[PDB]
């Protein structure tokens, strides 16, 4: 039999003050005492406060994905919240570490997220801002990833032939004196 | 406040075993603790010590103390900052008993790497507990799950540990097992290990993985079959691994020449495969 004119509650204010105490797992225990959920409480999704209290967004995503972390959707939301909490960027995500070079976290976040890795390999028109990265910063900053770069994106080479590491004289030389270098100098293929 | 804190500290530290708690560890220990303003700001080791005491105590039961009822009746002016200190030292205690292997008691965590605790958390049957551990490690130990996970993944990929990768990626990382295998592949030297890595990670990275990654695993197995066909038709492991790690530039003809009356049929079949 309690209320107010404004609209807050000693439990509304209790969660708010736990935020004023900046609680995540203690706030999670209180949430379980209320048995909280991914979105059952419409008042706990203040994007301004979510990023600004990145710990609070991390806890909310923790409830959502401890309810279900297997799904690419809820798990992707949890990963984005974790990136916002850890990476202090106003837009902190896979791209924040990618452009900076830490493509490891970039791939980890992009494995099961909107758009997708093969989609990025092909299509870059996904309006989801979380599915894009700064291209050159990450690219030159993806230096320790030769094999990863080759595997992720096919090389858009023209119809011209790629490197052919064997020559006619060369592959012929596997027959010992039959290395065609001793003659046929007018033919480059017998290199 | 320090002495009342210590009165609680006695009542608890003594309750820390099996002794029966007399009257006071259920009301007077609580009152003495409530009389303790062991406050925020830079303080001595006692504040964080008793904070970890209540918290790692909330990691226990049987006698009358915790951080739980502590928080219930311990919201005051000089306590929210100590609560934050309890968060830091409580991440410390939960990492102290790190991810508990009750079933696997043979493993000794006296000098164990973080890989075991991390894999146990990933494949844990408690996504709530796993997520709580990850969030606490991020907050009070400065470790993103993704960065450490990917570093350890590249580390395991360089060595080609198939079944363990299939097991741990089955927690959540089925999608990216093939990608990790591809990142570490140029660092491989044995055909059996490579096939095992592709099977238990890249093939384990099935539909949940990218099409390009599993396609690369399939093309690699096909190339391995073609190479086995050539080896049957025809060994320098140095030249073999040189071609293999360098196959991107090393032409198949380059490698084969690098390896008249022989089995033109065997090589012809190997080529007709392509």
Q: According to the 3-state scheme, what is the secondary structure of chain A?
A: CCCCCCCCCCCHHHHHHHHHCCCCHHHHHHHHHCCCCCCCCHHHCCHHHHHHCHHHHHHHHHHHHHHCCCCHHHHHHHHHHHHHHHCCCCCCCHHHHHHCCCHHHHHHHHCCCCCCHHHHHHCCCCCCHHHCCCHHHHHHCCCCCHHHHHHHCCCCCCCCCCCCCCCHHHHHHCCCCCCHHHCCCCCCCCC
Buried b (16+ CB within 10 A) or exposed e, B151-176: ebbbebbeebbbeebbebbebbbbbb
Put simply, the answer to whether A70 touches B132 (Cβ < 8 Å) is no
- Both structure tokens of A152: 């992720």
Contact at 8 Å (CB) between B38 and B78? yes
Q: Distances in Å between the alpha carbon of B238 and those of A147, B70, B242, B246, B259? A: 20, 66, 6, 12, 10
What is the distance between the alpha carbons of residues A88 and B264, in angstroms, rounded to a whole number?
63
Buried b (16+ CB within 10 A) or exposed e, B30-68: bebbbebebbbeeeeeebbebbbbbbbbbeeeebbbbbe
- How many CB atoms lie under 10 A from the CB of residue A136? 8
- Both structure tokens of B11: 């009542």
- Both structure tokens of B246: 């360098």
Please name which of B172, B217, B176, B226 lies closest in space to residue B198, comparing C-alpha atoms.
B217
Is B168 within 8 Å of chain A by CB?
Answer: no
Between A72-86 and B145-159, two packed helices, what is the crossing angle to 10 degrees? 110
Residue B102: strand, helix, or coil? coil
What is the distance between the alpha carbons of residues B259 and A148, in angstroms, rounded to a whole number?
28
Put simply, the answer to whether A105 touches B150 (Cβ < 8 Å) is yes
Q: According to the 3-state scheme, what is the secondary structure of B225-249?
A: HHHHHHHHHCCCHHHHHHHHHCCCC
Our CA angle for B113, B114, B120, nearest 5°, is 115
Phi, psi angles (nearest 5°) of residue A98: -65, -60
Contact at 8 Å (CB) between B147 and B114? no
Task: Count CA within 13 A, CB hemisphere, residue A95.
Answer: 15
Put simply, the answer to whether A97 touches B147 (Cβ < 8 Å) is yes
Cβ neighbours of B176 in A, within 8 Å = 107-108, 111
From the centroid of its chain, how far is CA A81? 12
- Residue B44, by phi and psi: left (phi above 0), alpha (psi -120 to 50) or beta? beta
To 10 degrees, the CA torsion angle through A78, A80, A83, A88? -120
Cβ neighbours of A115 in B, within 8 Å = none
Is A112 within 8 Å of chain B by CB?
Answer: yes
The structure tokens 């790690």 sit at: B245
Contact at 8 Å (CB) between B91 and A23? no
Contacts (Cβ under 8 Å, ≥6 apart) of B147: A97, A102, A104, A105, A108
Way it was determined? cryo-EM
CB under 8 Å, gap of 24 or more: what pairs does B41-46 form? B41/B81, B43/B85, B46/B2, B46/B5
Q: What is the CA radius of gyration of chain A?
A: 28
Phi, psi angles (nearest 5°) of residue B22: -80, -175
What is the distance between the alpha carbons of residues B100 and B167, in angstroms, rounded to a whole number?
18
- Residue A162, by phi and psi: left (phi above 0), alpha (psi -120 to 50) or beta? beta
Contact at 8 Å (CB) between A110 and A117? yes
From the centroid of its chain, how far is CA B100? 13
What is the distance between the alpha carbons of residues A25 and A66, in angstroms, rounded to a whole number?
12
Please name which of B151, B244, B185 lies closest in space to residue A149, comparing C-alpha atoms.
B185
- Residue A176, by phi and psi: left (phi above 0), alpha (psi -120 to 50) or beta? left
Contacts (Cβ under 8 Å, ≥6 apart) of B184: A147, B154, B156, B157, B158, B160, B197
End-to-end CA distance of chain B: 82
What is the distance between the alpha carbons of residues A87 and A90, in angstroms, rounded to a whole number?
9
When CB atoms are compared, the residue of A59, A86, A173 closest to B257 is A173
From the centroid of its chain, how far is CA B95? 13
List helix spans (H) across B16-79: 28-34, 45-58, 68-73
Phi, psi angles (nearest 5°) of residue A189: -60, -35
Put simply, the answer to whether A62 touches B128 (Cβ < 8 Å) is yes
Put simply, the answer to whether B131 touches A66 (Cβ < 8 Å) is yes
Contact at 8 Å (CB) between A106 and A120? no
Is B259 within 8 Å of chain A by CB?
Answer: yes
- Residue A35, by phi and psi: left (phi above 0), alpha (psi -120 to 50) or beta? left
What is the distance between the alpha carbons of residues A111 and A16, in angstroms, rounded to a whole number?
34
Q: Counting every residue, how long is chain B?
A: 274
List helix spans (H) across chain B: 2-15, 28-34, 45-58, 68-73, 80-96, 114-122, 127-141, 145-159, 162-169, 177-185, 191-197, 211-233, 237-245, 252-258, 264-272
What is the distance between the alpha carbons of residues B134 and B162, in angstroms, rounded to a whole number?
25
The DSSP symbol for B76 reads S
Burial class (CB in 10 A: 0-12, 13-18, 19+), B149: buried
Cβ neighbours of A86 in B, within 8 Å = 138, 144
Buried b (16+ CB within 10 A) or exposed e, B246-258: ebeebbbbbbbbb
The DSSP symbol for B21 reads P
Buried b (16+ CB within 10 A) or exposed e, A81-93: bbbbbbbeeeebb
């Amino acid at each position: 039999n309690y209320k107010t004119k404004e609209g807050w509650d000693f439990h509304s204010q209790f969660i708010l003050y736990c935020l004023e105490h900046s609680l995540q797992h203690l706030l999670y225990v209180y949430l379980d005492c209320y048995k909280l959920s991914p979105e059952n409480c419409p008042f706990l999704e203040k994007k301004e406060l979510h990023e600004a209290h990145p710990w609070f967004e991390f806890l909310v995503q923790c409830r959502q994905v401890a309810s279900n972390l297997t799904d690419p959707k809820l798990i992707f939301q949890a990963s984005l919240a974790n990136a916002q909490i850890l990476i202090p960027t106003n837009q902190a995500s896979v791209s924040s570490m990618l452009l900076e070079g830490h493509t490891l976290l970039a791939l980890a976040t992009t494995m099961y997220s909107p758009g997708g890795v093969s989609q990025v390999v092909q299509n870059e028109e996904n309006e989801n801002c979380l599915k894009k990265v700064d291209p050159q910063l990450l690219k030159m900053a993806l230096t320790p990833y030769p094999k990863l770069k080759t595997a992720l994106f096919p090389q858009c080479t023209p119809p011209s032939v790629l490197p052919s590491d064997i020559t006619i004289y060369h592959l012929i030389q596997s027959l010992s004196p039959f290395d065609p270098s001793r003659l046929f100098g007018w033919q480059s293929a017998n290199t | 406040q320090n002495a009342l804190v210590d009165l609680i500290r006695k009542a608890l530290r003594a309750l820390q075993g099996p002794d029966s708690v007399p009257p006071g560890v259920v009301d007077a220990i609580y009152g003495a603790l409530r009389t303790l303003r062991c406050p925020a700001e830079p303080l001595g080791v006692e504040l964080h010590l008793l904070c970890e005491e209540l918290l790692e105590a909330c990691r226990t039961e049987g006698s009358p103390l915790r951080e739980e009822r502590l928080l219930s009746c311990l919201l005051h002016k000089a306590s929210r900052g100590l609560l934050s200190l309890y968060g830091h030292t409580y991440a410390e205690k939960v990492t102290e008993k790190p991810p508990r292997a009750t079933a696997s008691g043979k493993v000794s965590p006296d000098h164990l790497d973080p890989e075991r605790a991390m894999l146990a958390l990933f494949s844990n049957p408690n996504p709530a507990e796993a997520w709580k551990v990850a969030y606490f490690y991020c907050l009070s130990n400065n470790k993103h799950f993704l960065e450490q996970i990917l570093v350890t993944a590249l580390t395991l990929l360089k060595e080609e540990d198939f079944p363990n990768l299939g097991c741990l990626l089955d927690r959540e990382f089925r999608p990216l097992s093939c990608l990790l295998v591809l990142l570490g592949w140029t660092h491989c030297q044995s055909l059996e290990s490579a096939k095992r890595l592709l099977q238990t990670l890249h093939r384990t990275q099935g539909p949940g993985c990218d099409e390009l990654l599993r396609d690369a695993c399939d093309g690699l197995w096909a190339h391995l079959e073609v190479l086995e066909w050539c080896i049957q038709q025809s060994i320098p492991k140095r030249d073999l691994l040189y071609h293999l790690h360098g196959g991107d530039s090393h032409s198949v003809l380059y490698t084969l020449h690098h390896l008249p009356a022989l089995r033109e049929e065997d090589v012809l079949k190997l080529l007709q495969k392509v």
